[PDB]
Amino acid sequence: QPDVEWAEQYGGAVMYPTKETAHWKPPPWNDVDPPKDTLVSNLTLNFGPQHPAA
């Protein structure tokens, strides 16, 4: 019989683990979290002070 302890080795990681790099994370079940963060993309203007014709 096989238990949960043996099942954790076959979990989403690297199959055979180890290696120089282990920075990869298991994939999310239904695609990635929104990278809603970073870059506001707000452009600031000094339209007024003097002579904008408007």
Added chain:
Amino acid sequence: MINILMLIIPILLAVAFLTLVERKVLGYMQLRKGPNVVGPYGLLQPIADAIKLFIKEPLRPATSSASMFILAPIMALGLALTMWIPLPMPYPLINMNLGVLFMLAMSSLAVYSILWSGWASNSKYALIGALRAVAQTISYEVTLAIILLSVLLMSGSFTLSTLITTQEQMWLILPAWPLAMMWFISTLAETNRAPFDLTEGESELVSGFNVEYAAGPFALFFMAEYANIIMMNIFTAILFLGTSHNPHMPELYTINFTIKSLLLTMSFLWIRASYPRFRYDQLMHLLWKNFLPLTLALCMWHVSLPILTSGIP
């Protein structure tokens, strides 16, 4: 070669003497006196601006860019004044293998003058006037080629020499009735002194290709921007006007051709004073949404016509 040098120096004077008309005709349109003090009727003022803006005015931008920026007024004149060469006239300077193809290609290449002026200042204030100048030109390049094709299929080939010979009895305004009305709007694709126009004039936003430029580059921009207005006025007087040809007497053609163009030269400054700006978003809705299905329907119509009744060069 002497003809090229006899088509830049008197032509730059025509862009110089335009400044009179730009505030004389526009002045009387607004009920105000224009040029008066400087000359007999202010005739010495247009030539005075060449002494004013070049010899004494010195500016170069602050943060700037490298080689580009000063490259742009060279691109302004050196692509808009070259447009005079393929013109059929009474007799053309090196008659092209296909005429209007060089006229359409170099006109789109002349748009780069306002495009490279966006990267003239590294600051974001100048490039808003450039990004607005993209869309106010990019959409109108579609119809400019399509409405040409409907006229070109009606008469001759791409060669500009054949377009003079095709109008012997009547003008091309009458067969191409809705298409002639389109070329009062589609001609204003380039940043010209008009109501439709592009991002070049002040009014609401900062002046495009002028806020970054000095006086000397900025003065060189006007000698190119107002030059395109005459160019479109002559080009309309070839495609839609003609009246007579006469290869024996060039004198009878040269007088008659100028009057037809000058009536159109007043008509764009007539447009400029009369009506407000069309807005960035809503100019994209005049064409594309409303005018592009109309022009293509007439393009569909002009394909059938030579097949319906014989009309092949």
